[PDB]
Design a protein around this nucleic acid. Sequence first.
RNA 1: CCUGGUGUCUUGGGUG
Lengths: 140, 49, 113, 263, 66, 133, 97, 533, 61, 196, 84
Amino acid sequence: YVDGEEEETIMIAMTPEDLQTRSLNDTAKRIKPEMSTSSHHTFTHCEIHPSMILGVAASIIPFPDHNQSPRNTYQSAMGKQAMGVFLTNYNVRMDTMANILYYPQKPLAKTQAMEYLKFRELPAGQNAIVAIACYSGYNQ
Amino acid sequence: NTPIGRDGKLAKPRQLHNTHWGLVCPAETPEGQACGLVKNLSLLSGISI
Amino acid sequence: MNAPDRFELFILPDDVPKLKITPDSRVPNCIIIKFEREDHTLANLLREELALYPDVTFVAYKVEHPLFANFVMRLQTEEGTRPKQALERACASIINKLKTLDHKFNEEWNIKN
Amino acid sequence: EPKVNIINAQDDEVELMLSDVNLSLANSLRRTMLAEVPTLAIDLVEIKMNTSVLADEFISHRLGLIPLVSEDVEEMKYSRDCTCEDYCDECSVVLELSARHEGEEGTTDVYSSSLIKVSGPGNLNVGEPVRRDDYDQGILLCKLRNHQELNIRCIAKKGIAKEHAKWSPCSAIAFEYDPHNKLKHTDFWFEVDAKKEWPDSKYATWEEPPKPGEVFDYKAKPNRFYMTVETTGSLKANQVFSRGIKTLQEKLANVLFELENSR
Amino acid sequence: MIIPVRCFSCGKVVGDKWDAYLRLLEEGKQEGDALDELKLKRYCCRRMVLTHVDLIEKFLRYNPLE
Amino acid sequence: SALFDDIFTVQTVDNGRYNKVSRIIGISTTNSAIKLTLDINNEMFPVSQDDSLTVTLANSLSLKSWRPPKPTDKSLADDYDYVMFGTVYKFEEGDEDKIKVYVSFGGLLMCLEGGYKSLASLKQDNLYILIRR
Amino acid sequence: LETDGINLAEVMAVPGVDSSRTYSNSFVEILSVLGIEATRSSLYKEILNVIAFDGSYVNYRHMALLVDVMTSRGYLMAITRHGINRADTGALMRCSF
Amino acid sequence: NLMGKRVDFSARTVISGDPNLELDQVGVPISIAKTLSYPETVTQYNIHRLTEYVRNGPNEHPGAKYVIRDNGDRIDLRYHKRAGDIVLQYGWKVERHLMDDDPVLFNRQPSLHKMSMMAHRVKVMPYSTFRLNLSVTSPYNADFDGDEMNLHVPQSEETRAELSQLCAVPLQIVSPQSNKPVMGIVQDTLCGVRKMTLRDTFIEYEQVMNMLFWVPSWDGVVPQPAILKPKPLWTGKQLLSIAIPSGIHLQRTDGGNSLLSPKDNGMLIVDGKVMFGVVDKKTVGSGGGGLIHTVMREKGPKICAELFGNIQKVVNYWLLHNGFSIGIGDAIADASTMKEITHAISSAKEQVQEIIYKAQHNELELKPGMTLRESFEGEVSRTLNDARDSAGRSAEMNLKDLNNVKQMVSAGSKGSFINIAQMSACVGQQMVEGKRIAFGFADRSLPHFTKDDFSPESKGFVENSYLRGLTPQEFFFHAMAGREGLIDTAVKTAETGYIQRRLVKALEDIMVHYDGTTRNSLGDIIQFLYGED
Amino acid sequence: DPTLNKTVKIRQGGYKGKIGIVKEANGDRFRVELHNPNKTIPIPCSFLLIESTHGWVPYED
Amino acid sequence: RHGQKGTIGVTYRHEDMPFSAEGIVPDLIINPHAIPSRMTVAHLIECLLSKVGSIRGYEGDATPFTDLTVDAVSNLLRDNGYQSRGFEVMYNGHTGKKLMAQVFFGPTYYQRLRHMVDDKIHARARGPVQVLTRQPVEGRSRDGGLRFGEMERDCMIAHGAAGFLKERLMEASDAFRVHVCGICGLMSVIANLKKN
Amino acid sequence: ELAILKEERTTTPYLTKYERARILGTRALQISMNAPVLVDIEGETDPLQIAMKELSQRKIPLVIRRYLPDGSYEDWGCDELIVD
RNA sequence: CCUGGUGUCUUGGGUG
Ligand SMILES: [Mg+2]
Ligand SMILES: [Zn+2]
Ligand SMILES: [Zn+2]
Ligand SMILES: [Zn+2]
């Protein structure tokens, strides 16, 4: 375990594959950093997974690296207002205001962190067939 | 939450510092007056007992 | 709370006519036909059939709003042919074509069975 | 003049090709088959005892989506056009469902086969639920545990799909034409080639491909339309087609009668 | 909660293909093969069974009030 | 019965950014210093390089509301191929032999460069162009 | 030349410097060196520059009225409680701010 | 309670979109129209019309709610069982429901400029959402993601005339802020009018008939087609000019093009007929000197408002019968331009390394007024910005004409060049407080880098794009930049509101008198002539 | 009117066979709040059936 | 799941919605204009992954910072009989004519927020007033009125409508008749109407 | 005293938008309270329509008292003000 | 047989 002060005098690696030097030219995938400023790096730590830097509401966003920061913030703020199944004993509880979805469905593009958030078991949404088009101008 | 209140200017305690890596969520934050102050811990965060 | 009734999309009121005809005095031999409690199904079927006629010079239809089940069609023929008789002949032709199609479909199903 | 060429036909779905017609006519026929076809679905749910974990309106909405046999629905009159008082035997079908699980262990799954037809316009074959075979339980409705009873009364009426989607006999009606794009009605979006990045339709072997040195026929019109009409079991495909044709003919006759009576 | 009766997109009756789907899954068959065996060529009907979450089993675990 | 008639040999054809609209440049054979840069369609009237086309510009097709052509009447368009109608939006009065006329057919642009003795009768409000062969 | 700081009175008297076109960004020193007529022009120029820096455009009448209201009593009147509430208007209007 | 109190006869709900309405029309629900009422005086020309509304009742629309005599006693129609024995006299008042052709005020908080309060005509519509035109969304600064707007109904006859002859929507077309209109054709309407005015656009007679019938101001005369043989085909320019009134001339030269127009640029409109020029944001947009301003200055407000609806309906029908969309492949480039982008990025990195080597060896030129570190940072930022601009320009030039993103960018309704640059080419350098990523750690920005690292990848230079994949460091930098921008916006909005409030409180008693002077409430002359003209 | 706040069925019209409660009875047109939807409708007097001690009695109740 | 919030503008039936070659109708229709400005390529990636998973038969792994690319998903989508970029030829639901431009089609995860229309609609003509100021109350559950702030007053002043602003704060608000003396100028005038 | 003669009026002879709106509102409010209409009423029975018809025919018996900042005023008749 | 009454102050999170 390391805190904010101990992280100042340590060298952490993003992925374990970066611990060893490789030997590409793919116009579809991302480009890894060159890191040609230092001759030889002496890594002392290694991150378990980068996707763990996010929180609870941010882990639900599918592929957050392909979005914008304001959009991600808006999604993380709106995720706390989605209708779904908050608890399994809603029939015996007398809350002031409760909203329960009819047919809760799990998303197709899920993340591994959801496996620890009980999202695939208690979802808050539906997989609807969406089309991107300009019909009779009633969707502008 | 940071007990600073809505009183103040600039953005010293509201901006996302570089030391917030792997400790708090860099995206989950309220909008309006509580933007930058109220934060949420990461998925692998821990508090000392 | 404010959602209109669904059965009103096909039920005609007692004080509202189904088919209204109004004359167009701006151009000779032109009529405006207002259809109530209808959709694009009969509208396009009548529009294309009227456009496929040589005596019809102009035929068009439009729905003012999808929330209301009604539309308006403009029909302007020549001096010799009346648009009402042309619409009646088009309706009769579509009826005969549908009857022939149903007969052929039944004859084909009797063999496929 | 219009010719019909049935490609495949069975009990539920039927795939055929319509020729010597018009595009607007095929669109109108599809819209009539998808909406303007009267069927028979549950319209009223009287609940006298419901101690299950589901809501009453939930069970009512689940029952409203149950397809019923409407083979003899043409002779059935509408509820809003009946001159009698309240529900009778000429405009409403009555069914009852009583379920109760006895035992401290287990779960009784109430299926659609428990819907017992009480009354109806005899001897018309209407009101019975749709079944695949003879041992199929049907659509799942609810699950009862210990000391959980469900007694419900279903009243089904005649209606079209314009009022509610539960009266729609057809589910997915596929319709296409011109697999080789001879009319140039669309612009294929491509990155390098449009003939390799776009897959071929399932009816590409039924029509000849255009010649590379063939001139553009500006007088060409859509003639052949391949249509696959599927049903949900409440009605047959040929019956649905015939009823849609009859509804279109009745609408045309009503329009022609109004035109002749307007004078 | 419970398996829907009709498809949200088209409207195919998919409420009677849950027990057979679970039985096919118990035999070691994959999800795609189990969906193809039930004559579900359209993805709109496959998403109603593959992405379905049965929650009535957890609600039935509670003791009845009456 | 016509205002101008000539035979132009197509020299350059540029498709441009559109796949159906192409700009063709032609020069008359019987007289020089007469150019014709016209936008035409490809799917309705395909042209090629070094092609002779008879171009006839007139003011009326008779030998205001549009109507479908009846199969019993005749006009000037019954003996031509590519028939178009448009409005002249420029009448440049240059230096004698240099006279440019700009016509627009719903967007299709035509620039005709010629003298005075051949284009003095083209000062009209509307123009019908007929291209044969 | 662009000189940091404000000192128009001593810069204008420097030989070889055009003592008729020297402009200052601070209108406070302009009001003391030149006058109120030049202060109005300097304020209008500054406001127009601030408006047009981001590509926006505002009509001349609005900025003219804005710079004429502040330059009406002879001195620079701020848009705060010190210059607005120090007028001869009614008490009910001054107490509403 | 005095400078800002609560008034009656006011409704508030979320608005919606409805291009099938007029410019000065608003869709009022049935329940809202039944709750709100207007007191009409019983005259000798509408007593028979008011008797029907009285007999209808407050539960049936159209109907009445209250009857007031000359003394002030109100008759409640909800409990009055003897409604059939009520005769109306001359001089009474009847509170009738909100019917059609009723000018009502419409607003949305906050109300910045004077165009925020507009008088619209009530149209009874179902549901519980306000139906507004898709052209008044620019002055309202509203969208359809949860915009609650306020509607007020006048309670007198003078207020109705004032709202109809002053705060009318067609009267608020040209704004005095920059002598330019504030409402124009945008969004999907602009995207459709950009494609309909193309040179290779041909429509058949069957569709041309329906498109001409969709014009309420159509004279009933079909225009002649551009091509007569071998098939009658019309052009979108003619069908667009049909809705344009006659007697309208507009000449706009773009890029110094000639009359032949090789790039199909410019704009020529003679006698209300568009000769050439693709209609986009520089024609029917909100800019000054366009077609909207020309029509407003020539014809009037009514014709200008009708032209908006005509163009909207025509373009909407054309787009519904045509179609437009977007996909992932619209943001993916070929394998030839990605290599050039990577080579440009490598050249920029090499230039940055050379600048670092020159600065660390006392071989860098010192900028006038800046130190070594400041000049170095400025040069690095300028080089990175130039490299990003070059990559974006290359990615945009790689796009074809059939690309939907390029079409939406050239239309001007939505998107720009930086959007394409960040989606296809490179994101760019993340700036924080005007500078780059500050060293939040010990001589570094992140623990995954070494100390004293001035490389672009260690200071907030997102090399990858949104399609490729942002690295965790680049993702954190982008999140920091977005958070800083959001905080700056949320802090500056209150300052701008306070500045506007102070300016309003300072300038509120100014009024131009009849003598041409501009004086306040005390009578002191601020300007001898308004605007010095 | 001794018919206020009473369970009433519908025998004719569109909503043929629906339970409702007489919320307001001003005259002829009775205001009935139905049980299936969440709305109150005006209905003529000859379109209702009031309950009693045996079945639904019409206007003779 | 990407910040693309939206309200329902209109509701279409089954026969009015567009359909592709297989007869699949969209459950929802969004605007393309909300794609290039907001830069939501992640939405398209998620839609493509969901379509691929629904065609094959598994849930795609949307974990960030992985080796999942776009071409690898496009290849699997093309190997199933569909287009590589997810484009499908959709038809018009009104006339049946083909669309010249293809339409993006596929499943996407959506959620319903707590903000609705029935929970925000409010209207009041003459309701209960306060006791201290005799003004309309504040609150939706108390049948209150809308607030006419200072910005609305300034906008009405800029419009030039003085009568409307005078009536909005008098007849349509909390007017009251007071009696003043012609000498003292105060409101300490004892008045009796029934005794005059 | 404070009244300016008709031969020394220096105000504008055209009717502004505010004055026109006020005149129309006053005429509509007067007609709504049973007032003798000076023109003929055909199909248009709305008070605002009758007021607009009376203004278009220049038959409104009203006089605008334009006030001056010094305290004086000018009375301009509606039958002489040129309306665009 | 008309007339008719449920509220002041705060704390935390959201909407445009
Ligand atoms: Mg908004
Ligand atoms: Zn019956
Ligand atoms: Zn389906
Ligand atoms: Zn006194």
